[PDB]
Ligand binder design. Structure first.
Ligand code: CLA
Ligand code: CLA
Ligand code: CLA
Ligand code: CLA
Ligand code: CLA
Ligand code: CLA
Ligand code: CLA
Ligand code: CLA
Ligand code: CLA
Ligand SMILES: CC(/C=C/C=C(C)/C=C/[C@@]12O[C@]1(C)C[C@@H](O)CC2(C)C)=C\C=C\C=C(C)\C=C\C=C(C)\C=C\[C@@]12O[C@]1(C)C[C@@H](O)CC2(C)C
Ligand code: SF4
Lengths: 742, 11, 55, 219, 42
């Protein structure tokens, strides 16, 4: 049954292996004859599946790598906390948050870079930060620096503990294979233990520490006069004065009359007027409910006892109209190969990150976060980029599994075979829908441009000539506006202010949130989003499905997952491996994410953000020209790229010069990438031949003969440089513009 | 806040 | 003790335990089954009491 | 004499241990897949040591309160077990030296004792070889790490008969378990009612109905 | 100790120590002599 199984000292810690490189693979271990050897030593460093074949060693290596990664993350967190404690102006920002810019980095005075120490405010000079850490610390209840120092020390200690644990589990006591394959216990502990207890404990902290300190802060008291958090725990009088319910203690909870706790566990919803964030009582209530739900749901699978459920029984016994026998051999597939689990987890994490970004810009969960425009922009863009990258990687790992871990003899699955047997219909229909969507979505813009250039503004697809309104979205907005009165009797207001109707919420003369209207431009942009998403899905799905074999190459599995081509014959067979399909899909993911972030930035700068006056009128940043100027490509090039780049390029001689320097550097790297993307290997090898002759003429030729990069390495270098250049350009442009004008 | 900035310029 | 909530959810817990026992014992009933039946009875009692008070 | 014994647990619990009642629902002492700090011998050693230390602590935490109430000690000396200075937020008392100096001294002395104990556990007869001012002769050990014996630790000659020795071992383990439960009760009571356990016993004896767990939790 | 020295003699580690030392020397020279566009010694 379920038990702990370990092996004692599988490997011995010794420096002998460090002396010689490439010990994992024999062909690497032989010795270097050409430079290519070096480039291989890094390519197969983490290819644990190809070093050996036993599952036990792979699992142990995976565990140790996870521990190392956790240690690195803890070290990074400790460094951030120590920087916040030592070189920062947190205490100044605490008293006057609206007129002080956060900053936690100070530049030395070595060469002339001291001009980077801009005057953020509050008697401090330093680089303004846009990580949103200050809002997190304020919402946590931290009001000093000693607490931050203690947190940093604890983080360092935790990093050391994680490193020791990784070493101990790889070199002293290594879990056996049967320990890993016990997924029922893993799921039970991950649901009930990690997600339930953690959120319950955080709810306890929020109820006991964050709520009273934040109440005192919002009441207008000076930060240096607020009582320390432990005084609230020790003294019941202070809590009773702040909340009378605590005077009754824990008696009501055991008596099931929970309404007595309605003082600090509410259901109002909406945004708090003082700070423009969600009510902390609602957040604590939500955390408590989530804890209860997760603790309940973590006791579903049978482990070592009579009660519970079996995953294999659930999968096998499920009979449906469309599936049939269906899920039969999926349990072995998902418990035998690591790559399938990696693919599913990567897809789920990417989707979760994107949803996180959307929900976080929609409803600000931290105090004084909505009015900080740079923080919002940075958080949204960063999280969406991360989600896109993870979603892309999922397909690559699925292709790896399909290539090297799929055999129909020992493990057979009906649904997978049924999907494989009719791939042509899937690909054909996906291709047709992609063509149709792209044709319509881009033809609308081209038609708008052409009718504009000919002096025919009455034949456009616009808000005045021919209208295409998103009626369904408007209906949903109206239903959500009307919901709190009838559909949600408990909720006092709307879940978020984004839905049409309601009132503007502004903090300190700056607009925090107001309803976002939808028109023709939103229709067109959403259809463009759908088109790009569909094309990326088509590329990745084709790469995954046609990995094992194709009509052109009937034996593509033998060649492997990473092979440049098959030869000049058959008319040319370049880029048929699934790796090349991933390399092609990266560009389209980049395109889609760039378009989406551009849309979000322009819409927010045009129709939401701005300034409010004493009289009551609202003046937006760009004057609300998105509704009429974004229906043509000329409008996107002139009113958005040309107009908003003034702050980036005219930042020389000021405290934002680094942004312009990075703006130029990203352009240089993007132009550099085309050198690898466009050319071929033979020319470079033939040039290196003459260079090597010139070297040998002077008796300075090396023993490791130079060799041009392989084809796959060239493509990888090209795509890496391209992505880095584009992302850095967008980063510099966004940050400079939103810091200057926001 | 002044001391934090001065920590960089001690030398 | 003796109030509406106590009597109601104690009765529901006892009924659920009785149902669990029949559909060191003459009939197989380990401690885990007793804990599960008691916990689900407590859950159902809390739910019905909270629903009744609100209305 | 089986308490909550399972089919898995009954396989490796042969009864050749003091206080072996076959109780192990979670199967921690299973004899395959044993490594690190999970081994039946190490677990038994830890249980014995915990029982000894818990008995010492349970006696010492309740002696001063009774001694003070009986009038056999000065009043300023008798204190509850958490006002002695262990938890400065709860209370503090003054001594002949600072608290941290006493901490360092206790750490040094206990390190000297416990490192020798650990080295004895690692190598059985090694610890009685090197010169230690002549005391090493009495620290050779009997070969069983749990019960070293010898003139220093068994000067009264108790437990010469094997049956009497087994009975004494059973008594020791039972008393250790009882003392561990008592110490846990001390901790929880001091966390809840904030008053020394002897006063809790006195209040319970004065009026059991009005003084129990329920009245403090009210309802 | 032999293999520790052998590993510390590998190319990336030796390269990073050498470049760090060179960067430190250049930094200290630039700090001692603030800025200079010509060679005025001779
Ligand atoms: C991509 C989509 C697209 C669309 C929808 C339009 C739409 C329009 N254009 Mg623009 N245009 C486009 C791209 C597009 N344009 C491009 C790329 C250019 C090049 C720059 C132009 C340049 C342009 C010019 C120069 C002019 C227009 C004008 C017009 C109008 C004329 C349409 C017409 O008469 O033919 C419609 C013809 C048909 C035969 C329709 C066929 C489609 C049917 C409905 C299919 C339905 C299929 C069926 C339901 C499927 C299932 C079958 C089942 C039932 C069995 C129309 C509003 C003209 C104008 O001024 O209008 C105001 C004009 O002079 N356009
Ligand atoms: C997680 C990553 C991380 C990162 C990127 C940084 C980054 C930085 N640190 Mg911080 N730091 C961190 C974690 C981190 N720190 C942790 C965990 C601690 C606690 C030990 C510190 C404690 C710390 C101190 C005490 C100082 C810095 C300083 C610096 C800056 C100069 C570093 C230098 O030039 O090296 C020097 C090169 C070698 C030692 C070789 C740089 C911005 C310096 C600073 O900014 O001064 C103004 C400085 O004085 N850091
Ligand atoms: C209730 C106990 C429990 C808890 C809390 C966890 C929690 C976790 N497990 Mg899981 N796991 C459990 C039971 C548990 N597991 C069991 C019984 C098995 C075997 C079936 C596994 C199998 C397993 C594997 C194979 C892996 C994990 C991993 C992870 C980590 C994921 C990283 C993360 O999400 O950051 C959340 C961040 C924090 C909570 C870190 C704080 C440190 C925690 C609190 C330490 C205490 C946890 C530990 C279980 C108890 C100590 C035991 C020891 C002292 C005797 C996280 C520490 C992955 C990992 O990261 O590798 C190390 C991983 O690869 N788990
Ligand atoms: C969640 C974590 C995750 C994990 C654990 C893995 C795990 C694995 N991947 Mg997958 N992968 C992921 C996410 C992940 N992947 C994502 C998000 C993508 C999409 C890009 C991919 C796409 C992918 C491809 C295309 C391939 C793999 C392969 C592999 C395997 C080999 C790893 C390797 O050799 O690299 C060793 C380390 C390196 C080569 C590092 C390269 C340097 C990076 C690319 C530079 C990033 C630049 C940096 C941020 C910029 C700073 C500038 C400054 C330094 C100047 C390994 C088992 C390889 C395979 O063959 O599997 C068997 C392979 O071909 N993966
Ligand atoms: C703007 C981007 C770009 C750049 C910079 C280059 C650069 C170059 N080209 Mg390429 N090329 C490009 C695009 C580009 N190309 C495109 C689009 C094509 C069409 C396919 C080609 C096709 C091509 C051909 C056919 C040939 C070249 C050759 C050359 C070299 C000419 C000699 C010279 O200029 O050296 C000047 C050197 C530099 C400017 C390189 C940059 C130096 C870096 C910045 C220094 C490192 C500093 C810093 C510490 C970096 C650290 C990195 C970090 C990770 C730590 C040079 C490497 C010719 C050749 O090889 O001559 C020998 C040649 O045969 N190119
Ligand atoms: C303080 C720690 C402690 C430790 C290490 C042991 C150790 C041992 N017990 Mg003992 N025992 C203890 C306390 C302890 N006991 C208490 C308080 C009682 C109640 C009177 C008992 C009653 C008891 C019985 C009835 C039996 C044993 C037996 C055993 C052995 C097998 C079971 C097992 O390996 O658990 C080792 C467990 C752990 C390493 C730690 C678990 C502690 C959890 C995680 C915390 C619970 C704390 C929380 C506040 C509640 C093992 C030598 C069995 C036997 O073989 O007899 C000799 C047996 O039948 N024990
Ligand atoms: C992240 C998840 C994680 C996971 C899944 C494991 C998993 C495991 N650990 Mg490892 N370990 C971890 C992190 C983790 N460890 C860390 C961070 C450390 C450094 C402290 C260690 C150090 C460690 C040691 C020293 C030992 C193990 C052993 C074990 C095994 C038995 C665990 C046991 O039965 O618990 C039983 C746990 C308890 C009764 C004690 C709980 C009391 C602690 C102090 C409370 C923690 C509460 C908070 C969250 C098992 C393979 C043991 C082994 O090898 O067994 C074969 C063992 O000897 N682990
Ligand atoms: C097991 C370990 C143990 C420990 C750590 C302590 C610890 C302590 N004892 Mg206790 N005590 C113990 C067992 C223990 N006792 C036992 C077995 C008895 C019965 C003889 C007593 C009876 C006792 C008395 C009579 C007194 C203490 C007092 C004290 C304190 C100082 C005495 C000292 O200097 O020596 C200190 C908190 C003294 C005190 O001042 O308490 C506050 C005090 O006068 N203890
Ligand atoms: C790599 C070679 C190197 C060299 C030759 C020097 C040389 C010098 N250092 Mg620098 N220094 C270096 C690296 C180096 N430093 C590094 C890596 C650091 C970061 C810890 C410093 C930080 C530093 C400080 C903090 C100080 C010097 C000072 C000095 C002087 C010492 C007398 C001399 C000019 C001292 C001085 O002249 O200050 C005015 C001084 O106080 N250095
Ligand atoms: C050592 C100990 C306490 C020692 C206390 C000492 C020295 C106190 C000393 C002092 O007071 C003095 C004298 C005077 C004060 O001024 C200062 C202090 C310092 C305060 C407690 C152990 C306390 C130990 C406890 C409570 C252990 C409980 C374990 C349980 C219940 C385990 C159960 C199971 O493991 C089984 C048995 C079998 C498995 O299959 C299933 C499960 C359920 C896991
Ligand atoms: S060698 Fe180059 S050009 Fe020829 S088939 Fe392969 S990838 Fe294509």
């Amino acid at each position: 049954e379920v038990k702990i199984l370990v092996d004692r000292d599988p490997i011995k810690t010794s420096f002998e292996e460090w002396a010689k490189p490439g010990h994992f693979s024999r062909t690497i271990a032989k010795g270097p004859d050409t430079t290519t050897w070096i480039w291989n030593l890094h390519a197969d460093a983490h290819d644990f599946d190809s070093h050996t074949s036993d599952l036990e060693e792979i699992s142990r290596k995976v565990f140790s790598a996870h521990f190392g990664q956790l240690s690195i993350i803890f070290l990074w967190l400790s460094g951030m906390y120590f920087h916040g404690a030592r070189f920062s102006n947190y205490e100044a920002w605490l008293s006057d948050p609206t007129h002080i810019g956060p900053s936690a980095q100070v530049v030395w005075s070595i060469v002339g870079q001291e001009i980077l120490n801009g005057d953020v405010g509050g008697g401090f000079r330093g680089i303004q930060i846009t990580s949103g850490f200050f809002q997190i610390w304020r919402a946590s209840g931290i009001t000093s620096e000693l607490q931050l120092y203690c947190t940093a020390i604890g983080g360092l200690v935790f990093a050391a503990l994680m490193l020791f644990a990784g070493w101990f589990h790889y070199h002293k006591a290594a879990p056996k294979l049967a320990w890993f394959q016990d997924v029922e216990s893993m799921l039970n502990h991950h649901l009930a233990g990690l997600l339930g207890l953690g959120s319950l404990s955080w709810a306890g902290h929020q109820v006991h520490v964050s709520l009273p300190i934040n109440q005192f802060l919002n009441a207008g008291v000076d930060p240096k006069e607020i009582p320390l958090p432990h005084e609230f725990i020790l003294n019941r009088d202070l809590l009773a004065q702040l909340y009378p319910s605590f005077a009754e203690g824990a008696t009501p909870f055991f008596t099931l009359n929970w309404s007595k706790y309605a003082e600090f566990l509410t259901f109002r919803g909406g945004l708090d007027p003082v700070t423009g964030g969600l009510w902390l009582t609602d957040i604590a209530h939500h955390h408590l409910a989530i804890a209860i739900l997760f603790l309940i749901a973590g006791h579903m699978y049978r482990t070592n006892w009579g009660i519970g459920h079996g995953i294999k029984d659930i999968l096998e016994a499920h009979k449906g109209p469309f599936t049939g026998q269906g899920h039969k051999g999926l349990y072995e597939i998902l418990t035998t190969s690591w790559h399938a689990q990696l693919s599913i987890n990567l897809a789920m994490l990417g989707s979760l990150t994107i949803v996180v970004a959307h929900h976080m810009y929609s409803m600000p969960p931290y105090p004084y976060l909505a009015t900080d425009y740079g923080t919002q922009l940075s958080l949204f863009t960063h999280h969406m980029w991360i989600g896109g990258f993870l979603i892309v990687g999922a397909a690559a790992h699925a292709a790896i599994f399909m290539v090297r871990d799929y055999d129909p003899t020992t493990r057979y699955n009906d649904l997978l075979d049924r999907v494989l047997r009719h791939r042509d219909a899937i690909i054909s229909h996906l291709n047709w829908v992609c063509i149709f969507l792209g044709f319509h979505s881009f033809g609308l813009y081209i038609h708008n441009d052409t009718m504009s250039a000919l002096g025919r503004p009455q034949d456009m697809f616009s808000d005045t000539a021919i209208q295409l309104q998103p009626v369904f979205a408007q209906w949903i907005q109206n239903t959500h506006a009307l919901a709190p009165g009838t559909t949600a009797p408990g909720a006092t207001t709307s879940t978020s202010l984004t839905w049409g109707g309601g009132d503007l919420v502004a903090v300190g003369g700056k607009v925090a949130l107001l309803p976002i209207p939808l028109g023709t431009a939103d229709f067109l942009v959403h259809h463009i989003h759908a088109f790009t998403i569909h094309v990326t899905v088509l590329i990745l799905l084709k790469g995954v499905l046609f990995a094992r074999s194709s009509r052109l190459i009937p034996d593509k599995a033998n060649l492997g997952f990473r092979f440049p081509c098959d030869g000049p014959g058959r008319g040319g067979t370049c880029q048929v491996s699934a790796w090349d399909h991933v390399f092609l899909g990266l560009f389209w993911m980049y395109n889609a994410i760039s378009v989406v972030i551009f849309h979000f930035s322009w819409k927010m700068q045009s129709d939401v953000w701005g300034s409010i006056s004493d009289q009551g009128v609202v003046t937006h940043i760009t004057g609300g020209n998105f509704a009429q100027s974004s229906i043509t490509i000329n409008g996107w090039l002139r009113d958005f790229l040309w107009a908003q780049a003034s702050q980036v390029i005219q930042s020389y001689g000021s405290s934002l010069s680094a942004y312009g320097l990075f703006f130029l550097g990203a352009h240089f790297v993007w132009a550099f990438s085309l050198m690898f993307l466009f050319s071929g290997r033979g020319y470079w090898q033939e040039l290196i031949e003459s260079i090597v002759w010139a070297h040998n003429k002077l008796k300075v030729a090396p023993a490791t003969q130079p060799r041009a990069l392989s084809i796959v390495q060239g493509r990888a270098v090209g795509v890496t440089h391209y992505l880095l250049g584009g992302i850095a350009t967008t980063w510099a442009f966004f940050l400079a513009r939103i810091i200057a004008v926001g | 806040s002044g001391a934090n900035f001065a920590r960089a310029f001690t030398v | 003790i003796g109030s509406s909530t106590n009597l109601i959810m104690v009765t529901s817990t006892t009924l659920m335990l009785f149902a669990g026992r029949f559909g060191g014992d003459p009939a197989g009933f380990t401690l885990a089954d007793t804990l599960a039946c008691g916990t689900v009875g407590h859950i159902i009692g809390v739910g019905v009491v909270l629903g009744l008070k609100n209305i | 004499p089986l308490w909550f014994a399972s089919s898995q647990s009954l396989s490796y619990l042969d009864g050749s241990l003091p206080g072996d009642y076959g109780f192990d629902p979670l199967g921690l002492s299973d004899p395959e897949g044993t490594g690190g700090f999970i081994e039946p011998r190490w677990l038994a050693y830890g249980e014995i040591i915990h029982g000894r230390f818990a008995m010492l602590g349970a006696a010492g935490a309740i002696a001063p309160e009774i001694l003070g109430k009986a009038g056999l000690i000065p009043a300023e000396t008798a204190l509850p077990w958490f006002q002695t200075g262990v938890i400065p937020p709860a209370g503090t008392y003054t001594y002949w030296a600072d608290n941290y100096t006493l901490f360092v001294l206790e750490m040094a002395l206990m390190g000297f004792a416990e490192h020798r104990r650990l080295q004895d556990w690692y190598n059985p007869g090694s610890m009685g070889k090197q010169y230690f001012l002549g005391l090493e002769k009495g620290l050779a050990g009997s070969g069983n790490p749990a019960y070293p014996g010898g003139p220093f630790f068994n000067p009264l000659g108790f437990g010469k008969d094997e049956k009497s020795l087994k009975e004494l071992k059973l008594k020791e383990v039972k008393n250790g378990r009882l003392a561990m439960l008592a110490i846990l009760g001390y901790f929880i009571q001091g966390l809840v009612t904030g008053v020394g356990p002897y006063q809790n016993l006195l209040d319970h004896l004065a009026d059991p109905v009005n003084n129990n767990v329920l009245t403090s939790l009210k309802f | 100790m032999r293999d520790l020295k052998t590993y510390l003699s590998v190319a990336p580690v030796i390269s990073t120590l050498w470049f760090a030392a060179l960067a430190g020397l250049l930094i200290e020279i630039n700090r001692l002599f603030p800025d200079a566009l010509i060679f005025p010694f001779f």
